[PDB]
C-alpha cells in the first residue's frame, strides 16, 4: 500500500510541476483572501 507507486503510472514530469503550481496558487490564494477580508494586512502595508 505504497502511494509512491503512483509515479509508476503518472510521470513525475507531468504531475510534479502541476502540484508545484497548485501549491504556489494556493498560498497566493490564502494571502489574497486574508488581504481582502481583513482590515489589518492592508493597514500593516499602509503603516503610519
Amino acid at each position: 500500500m505504497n502511494e509512491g507507486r503512483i509515479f509508476l503510472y503518472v510521470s513525475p514530469e507531468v504531475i510534479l510541476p502541476i502540484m508545484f503550481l497548485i501549491l504556489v496558487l494556493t498560498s497566493l490564494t490564502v494571502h489574497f483572501a486574508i488581504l481582502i477580508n481583513t482590515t489589518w494586512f492592508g493597514d500593516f502595508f499602509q503603516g503610519s
Binding site: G4, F7, L8, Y9, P12
Partner: protein, 47 residues
C-alpha cells in the same frame, strides 16, 4: 526489482520520489507551523 513501468521508472525510483516529497512536506510543515505561531502572536487573529 527490475521491471520498468510505462512512466519509465522502477519501484525503487518511485518510492524515492515519494520519500523526497514527504521529507520536503515535513520541512514545509515546520516552517508553516513557525509562521502560524508568529501570526498568532502578532496578527489580531484567533484572539
Amino acid at each position: 526489482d527490475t521491471k520498468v513501468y510505462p512512466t519509465g521508472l522502477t519501484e525503487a525510483q518511485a518510492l524515492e520520489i515519494n520519500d523526497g516529497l514527504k521529507w520536503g512536506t515535513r520541512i514545509y510543515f515546520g516552517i508553516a507551523v513557525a509562521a502560524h505561531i508568529l501570526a498568532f502572536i502578532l496578527t489580531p487573529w484567533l484572539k
